[PDB]
Design a binder for this molecule. Structure first.
Ligand SMILES: *[C@@H]1O[C@H](CO)[C@@H](O[C@@H]2O[C@H](CO)[C@@H](O)[C@H](O)[C@H]2NC(C)=O)[C@H](O)[C@H]1NC(C)=O
Ligand SMILES: *[C@@H]1O[C@H](CO)[C@@H](O)[C@H](O)[C@H]1NC(C)=O
Ligand SMILES: *[C@H]1O[C@H](CO)[C@@H](O)[C@H](O)[C@H]1NC(C)=O
Lengths: 238, 612
């Protein structure tokens, strides 16, 4: 049995994308499940895609680049369990549903770097024990759920720069034993002791990890709002 | 007939150490020598040295220089000809100068009994006061017409007495004492019937047009020496050409009777050292313009297409030991480089200058030196850059970064903390190993558009794109990929900044469509590349013009057709088999057909009546 492409993928742009992928002539060409099972990468950055509906039927996709599109819903990605790379940078995600990543256990790189997120679901990244890079920069993040990063022990690179965080939960980074790069700058950190103790302590304890715009070791990069002074320079005392 | 060949020399007035070193150096070049392919330079030879070995010489291709010798005699008794390929002061084929010293002693004897012709060049004599007898020599017979204007014949002998030309010589012309030295004449002593030289005075004593010095008969194989080329005991305008035209196959064939030109000799295979040239010569080595490629079994010389590959060290290696960055000192050592065995660092010191190192500030313009680079073996690190430069202009020709070494053992490409607006690495097609970091470039847009995986040759590679310009800003300022670029990104806003073109590409530029119905020139498409259709094919108004690069691949031929090939003029005078010219004519339908064999000088129709 075969089925036309735009029947499976309603979005014109994505249909054109899949057609391009399989070297077909027209979105009206029909395809066999064996042809669908051939797709292991999709490079669809900046293609005006508003919906990836139909992507559920590509079981073997490993490498998925959807950055710079107009996506607001990614529930169709749920069952793609072979996924190892997921680029969703500069799309239109205002909210992630719960358990959206619960299946994606093989993920090693996840970029959500410039969507318009405001909070994160509780335990959204917990099943991602293999993840090595997490980009959450330049969103509108207000606060982090407690122990949001607790499962991310392979993670080497965390990006939180340019958000709207004023405080992080105590001990939020403690389990990041493999962390080599973290970006904290351009947040209005509320350097009010005794609230800011853990973040000062942690930055100080791991000053080598904390990085600036140029990827250089720069533990002063995190700055108190109002003051504009380094977070780690704050001693909040007993 | 095939003689014994000597490379020659072009030292001019230089001396290789001791007079004895010089001499022994000279004797090693011309021992057992008959033909000299370069120039012959007899220099700084002193009295009582045996120049007996020079008698063997018979012809010289370049120029002859006899300078600064105090030896009594130079026995060039058998030199017959100077071709004059090369000139000494760009007028002179033969030059004899200042063979004298303050010891009051000098060169007396120069018996060129047999010097009979100089094809190109003039002569000069100055300050050979010991020398005599040569003043008698009449140079109308030896020299070409065109050159006698640039002759500088100052003869003065005061140093000694000389002998008089044995009366047997004609008009007292001798190269020295004895009738054996009388000047032989073969040009100005002949009836007007003879264009070439002569062996007697009559109009039957004429020689062939291809004889140079003189003759044993009128035939083409009777010359003493050839004007142009010698092909195994005959003299010829040109050697048999390597390519013949096959009129049944319509393409050029290699003729097995073809030969290459070694000096002035026609030879089937060039010598071993040697290489072939586009004109067909066999030559010592290909020009610094060029490199060697063995093609169809022959080692021909091909021209670079770009600066010839040159391999230079990167910073921290060899030349650049204990350096921290490409700086004002060392940036010049990268001139004409194609490939760097190592890493590049362009750091902020380079622009500031460093005084502890004694290093001055770097003039930005000089970064253009790096435009020649197409390969880096290690990493590329740029932490500093001119502030009024939009992109990385110096690296627009960089094709590959192999990353065998890596910054912090991680990054093979690090563009950090710059004011650029685009990367502009238009030519970059592979980053073999090592990661990528583009970080802290506040004005930089376009970076996240690139499908970096397309460049990666090792599977664990990753890209860090952090704190550059916001995509939202970059988008709103219209600094986005061109509409003609693929979804695979760009290095800037232009259609030549694309990584793959959306439809097709012309040059390095990208789409929108290749010239098929409309065309500045019409084109055809293969591998999504717009390719020009051949010139001799007439552009079709309702259909396509070409289906391929060649004149085979055209729909209508503009002018004439020869077999399959559409051609501007039909072959008329081209060489073929059995050493005969080929003549075609066009019929009324502009198809070109072969002429009657008898129509040797050409034709207008079939068989004669074609050939009246
Ligand atoms: C600029 O480049 C020059 C040339 O490579 C460097 O000069 C070398 O400096 C080291 C360190 O002082 C010496 O040990 C070498 O002997 C110098 N070599 C030469 C050829 O002069 C210079 O150090 C570089 N300066 C900077 C700031 O990068
Ligand atoms: C260029 O390609 C795009 C994407 O396939 C398409 O919309 C358009 O058909 C093409 N334009 C041409 C062939 O002129
Ligand atoms: C870029 O150059 C310097 C160094 O990065 C930086 O201070 C400045 O903001 C920029 N200046 C100009 C004139 O573009």
């Amino acid at each position: 049995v075969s089925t036309p492409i735009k029947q499976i993928f309603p979005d014109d742009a994505f249909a054109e994308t899949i057609k391009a992928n399989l070297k077909k002539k027209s979105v009206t060409d029909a395809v066999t499940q064996n042809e669908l099972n051939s797709i292991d990468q999709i490079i669809a950055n900046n293609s005006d895609i508003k919906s990836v509906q139909g992507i559920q039927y590509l079981p073997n996709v490993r490498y998925l680049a959807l950055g710079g599109n107009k996506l607001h819903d990614i529930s169709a990605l749920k069952e793609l369990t072979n996924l190892t790379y997921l680029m969703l940078h500069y799309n239109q995600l205002q909210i992630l549903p719960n358990g959206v990543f619960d299946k994606l256990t093989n993920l090693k790189e996840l970029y959500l770097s410039e969507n318009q997120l405001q909070s994160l679901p509780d335990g959204v990244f917990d099943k991602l024990t293999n993840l090595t890079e997490l980009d959450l920069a330049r969103n509108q993040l207000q606060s982090l759920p407690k122990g949001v990063f607790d499962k991310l022990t392979q993670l080497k690179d965390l990006r939180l720069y340019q958000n709207q965080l004023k405080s992080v939960p105590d001990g939020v980074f403690d389990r990041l034993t493999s962390l080599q790069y973290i970006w904290l700058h351009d947040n209005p950190w509320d350097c009010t002791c005794p609230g800011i103790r853990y973040l000062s302590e942690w930055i100080n304890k791991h000053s080598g990890v904390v990085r600036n715009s140029a990827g250089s070791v720069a533990p002063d990069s995190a700055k108190c709002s109002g003051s504009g002074k380094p977070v780690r320079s704050i001693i909040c005392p007993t | 007939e095939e003689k014994k060949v000597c490379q020659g020399t072009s030292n001019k007035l230089t001396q290789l150490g001791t007079f004895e070193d010089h001499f022994l150096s000279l004797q090693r070049m011309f021992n057992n020598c008959e033909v000299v392919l370069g120039n012959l330079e007899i220099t700084y030879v002193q009295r009582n040295y045996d120049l007996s070995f020079l008698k063997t010489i018979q012809e010289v291709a370049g120029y002859v220089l006899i300078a600064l010798n105090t030896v009594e005699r130079i026995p060039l008794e058998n030199l017959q000809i100077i071709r004059g390929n090369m000139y000494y002061e760009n007028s002179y084929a033969l030059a004899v100068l200042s063979n004298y010293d303050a010891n009051k002693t000098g060169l007396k004897e120069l018996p060129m009994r047999n010097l009979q012709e100089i094809l190109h060049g003039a002569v000069r004599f100055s300050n050979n006061p010991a020398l005599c007898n040569v003043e008698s020599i009449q140079w109308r017979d030896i020299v070409s017409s065109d050159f006698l204007s640039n002759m500088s014949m100052d003869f003065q002998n005061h140093l000694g007495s000389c002998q008089k030309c044995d009366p047997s010589c004609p008009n007292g012309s001798c190269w020295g004492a004895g009738e054996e030295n009388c000047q032989k004449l073969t040009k100005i002593i002949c009836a007007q019937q003879c264009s070439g030289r002569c062996r007697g005075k009559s109009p039957s004593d004429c020689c062939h047009n291809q004889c140079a010095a003189g003759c044993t008969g009128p035939r083409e194989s009777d010359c003493l020496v050839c004007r142009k080329f010698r092909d195994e005991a005959t003299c010829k305008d040109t050697c048999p050409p390597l390519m013949l035209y096959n009129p049944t196959t319509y393409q050029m064939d290699v003729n097995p009777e073809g030969k290459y030109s070694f000096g002035a000799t026609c030879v089937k295979k060039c010598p071993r050292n040697y290489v072939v040239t586009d004109h067909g010569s066999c030559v010592r080595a290909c020009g610094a313009d060029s490199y060697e490629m063995e093609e169809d079994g022959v080692r021909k010389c091909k021209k670079c297409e770009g600066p010839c590959r040159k391999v230079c060290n990167g910073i921290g290696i060899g030349e650049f030991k204990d350096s921290l960055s490409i700086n004002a000192t060392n940036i010049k050592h990268f001139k004409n480089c194609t490939s760097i065995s190592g890493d590049l660092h362009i750091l902020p010191v380079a622009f500031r200058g460093d005084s502890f190192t004694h290093t001055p500030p770097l003039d930005p313009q000089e970064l253009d030196i790096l435009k020649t680079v197409k390969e880096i073996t290690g990493f590329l690190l740029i932490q500093a850059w001119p502030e009024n430069r939009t992109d990385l202009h110096a690296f627009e020709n960089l094709e590959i970064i192999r990353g065998r070494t890596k910054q912090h053992g991680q990054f093979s490409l690090a563009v950090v903390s710059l004011n650029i607006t685009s990367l502009g690495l238009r030519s970059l097609k592979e980053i073999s190993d090592g990661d990528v970091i583009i970080s802290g470039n506040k004005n930089l847009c376009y970076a996240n558009t690139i499908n970096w995986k397309k460049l990666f040759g090792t599977s664990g590679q990753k890209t860090k794109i952090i704190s550059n310009r916001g995509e939202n800003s970059c988008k709103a300022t219209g600094q986005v990929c061109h509409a003609l670029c693929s979804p695979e990104g760009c290095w800037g806003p232009e259609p030549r900044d694309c990584v793959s073109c959306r439809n097709v590409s012309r040059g390095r530029e990208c789409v929108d469509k290749c010239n098929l119905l409309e065309g500045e020139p019409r084109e055809f498409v293969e591998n999504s590349e717009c390719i020009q259709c051949h010139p001799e094919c007439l552009p079709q108004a309702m259909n396509i013009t070409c289906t391929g690069r060649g004149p085979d691949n055209c729909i209508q031929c503009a002018h004439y057709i020869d077999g399959p090939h559409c051609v501007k003029t039909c072959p008329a005078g081209v060489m073929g088999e059995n050493n005969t010219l080929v003549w075609k004519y066009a019929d009324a339908g502009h198809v070109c057909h072969l002429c009657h064999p008898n129509c040797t000088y050409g034709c207008t129709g079939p068989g004669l009546e074609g050939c009246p």
